[PDB]
């Protein structure tokens, strides 16, 4: 029921602020989690970061020093800024919605559980070249 549409500049100069936007037409942006993945050529696709429904961010430790993800409230859109991009940040960026499931193997009070995430709905993908 959710359609995702990516929109990016495609080309960014080195050492700048790469900015991409993901437009959602299905539902509200404050109900499900959202995340960014990049398929780089010659490599496996990389998960870079995500943003929750409660507006809290998490980033990949390799790119946590350079990435930031934002969510618009009036517009049904989510933006991703990447500061100081280099020749290695060229990839096909896919925005994807995500669901938080928790897997429990013991007693709830003791802890012994962990949160796992899965991206059911993806976008078509926007290519970004540096």
């Amino acid at each position: 029921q959710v359609q995702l549409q990516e929109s990016g500049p495609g080309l960014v100069r080195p050492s700048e602020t790469l900015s991409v936007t993901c437009i959602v037409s299905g539902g509200s942006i404050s109900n499900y989690y959202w995340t960014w993945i990049r398929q780089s050529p010659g490599k496996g696709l990389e998960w870079i970061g995500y943003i929750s429904d409660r507006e809290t961010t998490t980033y990949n430790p390799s790119l946590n020093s350079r990435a930031v993800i934002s969510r618009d409230t009036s517009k049904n859109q989510l933006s991703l800024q990447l500061r100081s991009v280099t020749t290695a940040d060229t990839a096909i960026y896919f925005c994807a919605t995500a669901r938080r499931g928790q897997r429990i193997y013991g007693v709830v009070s003791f802890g012994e559980f962990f949160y796992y995430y899965y991206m059911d709905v993806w976008g078509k993908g926007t290519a970004v070249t540096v």
Binding site: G106, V107, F110, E112
Partner: protein, 49 residues
């Protein structure tokens, strides 16, 4: 890797605590109120089961 722990049924413990306090009241009075708390301190073998 989990945590070692011990269970006890809650209702049976409540009932046995009640029958303990009913006899405790035989040497301190029916009206005096008594309570139960954990250990006050000391060595490890004293403050724990």
């Amino acid at each position: 890797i989990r945590q070692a722990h011990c269970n006890v049924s809650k209702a049976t413990w409540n009932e046995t605590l009640g029958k303990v306090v009913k006899q405790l009241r035989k040497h301190f009075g029916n009206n005096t109120i008594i309570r139960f708390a954990n250990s006050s301190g000391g060595d490890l073998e004293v403050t724990t089961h």
